[PDB]
A paper describes a structure:
Present in the small intestine, cellular retinol binding protein 2 ([name]) plays an important role in the uptake, transport, and metabolism of dietary retinoids. All CRBPs share the same protein structure architecture. By examining chemical libraries of bioactive lipids, we provided evidence for the selective interaction of [name] with a subset of nonretinoid ligands with the highest affinity for sn-1 and sn-2 MAGs that contain polyunsaturated C18-C20 acyl chains.
1-arachidonoylglycerol (1-AG) interacts with [name] with a Kd of 37.9 ± 3.3 nM. Inside the binding cavity, the arachidonoyl chains of 1-AG and 2-AG adapted the same orientations enforced by hydrophobic and van Der Waals interactions with the side chains of the enclosed portal region of the protein. Also, the position of the oxygen atoms of the ester bonds were nearly overlapping (root-mean-square deviation of atomic positions, 0.3 Å), as they were locked in place by hydrogen bonds between the carboxyl oxygen and an ordered water molecule (W1) as well as the potential interaction of the ester oxygen with the ζ amino group of K40. Thus, the identical contact points between these ligands and the protein observed for 1-AG and 2-AG could be achieved only by adapting an alternative orientation of the glycerol backbones in the binding pocket (root-mean-square deviation value for the glycerol carbon atoms = 1.3 Å). The only consequence of this difference is the 1 Å shift of the sn-3 hydroxyl group toward the location normally occupied by an ordered water (W2) in the 2-AG/[name] complex.
Author numbering: 0 to 133
The structure:
């Protein structure tokens, strides 16, 4: 029983964020800034209802969802695309499929020990982030 992801989480590693952003067609100048940054993630979770806020000195991104309920997601200030998003549980892993113009786009987020893991996929690029609880 490790579905409770509530907390404030600080990034400690961010593997292949450059490749993930390139797969999303983020321009070089934006990648140059974004790859430098430590992200913070605040998760407010009530059962299957999630409110998430990911922050940095350069851009912030909020996404709220209920597990099992498809929603329209606009990735404002990231790659600025519209997708249909669905988050489901696979065991205690949150799995999101973002259906839209990019093939094989989604993410998976789970608790393991005292860490939050987030793997973001776009095409053949996977970015693996690890966060430690504040
Ligand atoms: C927002 C801080 C990073 C900004 C970097 C600025 C520009 C880079 C442009 C595009 C890169 C694409 C995505 C950024 C990566 C992670 C932010 C969270 C994405 C997400 O939905 O979290 C999954 C899940 O945690 C949400 O609940």
């Amino acid at each position: 029983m490790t579905r409770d992801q509530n907390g404030t989480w600080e990034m400690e590693s961010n593997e292949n964020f450059e490749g993930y952003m390139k797969a999303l067609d983020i321009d070089f100048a934006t990648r140059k800034i974004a790859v430098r940054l430590t992200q913070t993630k605040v998760i407010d979770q009530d059962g299957d209802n999630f409110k998430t806020k990911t922050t940095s000195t350069f851009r912030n991104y909020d996404v709220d969802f209920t597990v099992g309920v498809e929603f329209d997601e606009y990735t404002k200030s990231l790659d600025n695309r519209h997708v249909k998003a669905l988050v489901t549980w696979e065991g205690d892993v949150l799995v999101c499929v973002q259906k839209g113009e990019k093939e094989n786009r989604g993410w998976k987020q789970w608790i393991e020990g005292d860490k939050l893991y987030l793997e973001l996929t776009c095409g053949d690029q996977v970015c693996r982030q690890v966060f430690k609880k504040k």
